[PDB]
Structure formats: structure tokens, C-alpha cells
Design a protein around this ligand. Structure first.
Ligand SMILES: CCCCNS(=O)(=O)c1ccccc1
Length: 117
């Protein structure tokens, strides 16, 4: 990955909170990173939780595309922008399910783009 060790420091406090709130295990996170994701609230609500902590989504899981693209390396932004044209706006039954659907769409469309810390 292009994700540097810094980001792990930066997200540590929110990561710990989000996992505690939702019953998330590190194994579930590792799985999403390997492209294995199911619609289980303990992982889908974790992803919403962390996105929200960094202002990447609002109260109804609408994505701030400019902030999201801003997370990614310059060299990935062209292809990520195409992916967001396909996968946004979000849709689903609740905030966690919206992020499930988004993650599945990004992972299906682009290898290097969705990542979960
Ligand atoms: C392309 C967006 C990735 C979303 N993954 S994440 O929810 O773990 C997350 C990563 C980094 C900051 C906040 C949330």
C-alpha cells in the first residue's frame, strides 16, 4: 500500500473508539482490506464511524468527494474520481449499509482505492 505509518498514529484514538462502539475486531478490518466484506454492522458501522470522524461523510452518509479524493495520493486521483462518478451518491438502508454499498462498489471498480485502517 501507499498508506504510510503516520496515518496509523493519526487515526489511533478514533479507531479505538469506533471499534469499541461497534464491536469491531481487527480481523474484520483485515478482511475488508483483503476485499472480503459482508453487511455486518460491526464492520460497516466501523467504516461509517471512521469516515465521520474525519469529516468524509455527513449525518446521512453523503460523501464529501473533494475531501475523500484529498485523502488519496495525487497519482491515484484521476482513477478515483472516475470511481466516485460511478459509486456516488450513496444509497442503502441506513448510514452503515450506505457505506457497505459504497465500499463494495469501490472495491469492484478499482483495486487500490478503498482501504480500511
Ligand atoms: C477511500 C476511503 C477509505 C475509507 N476507509 S476508512 O473508513 O477506514 C477510513 C480511512 C481513512 C480515514 C477515515 C476513514
Amino acid at each position: 500500500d501507499w498508506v504510510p505509518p503516520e496515518v496509523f498514529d493519526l487515526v489511533a484514538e478514533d479507531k479505538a473508539r469506533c471499534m469499541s462502539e461497534h464491536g469491531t475486531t481487527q480481523a474484520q478490518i483485515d478482511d475488508v482490506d483483503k476485499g472480503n466484506l459482508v453487511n455486518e454492522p460491526s464492520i460497516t458501522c466501523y467504516m461509517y464511524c471512521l469516515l465521520e470522524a474525519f469529516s468524509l461523510v455527513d449525518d446521512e452518509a453523503n460523501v464529501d468527494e473533494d475531501i475523500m479524493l484529498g485523502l488519496l495520493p495525487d497519482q491515484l486521483q484521476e482513477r478515483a474520481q472516475s470511481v466516485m462518478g460511478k459509486c456516488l451518491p450513496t444509497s442503502g438502508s441506513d448510514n452503515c449499509n450506505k457505506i457497505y454499498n459504497l465500499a463494495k462498489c469501490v472495491q469492484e471498480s478499482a483495486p487500490d482505492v478503498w482501504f480500511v485502517i
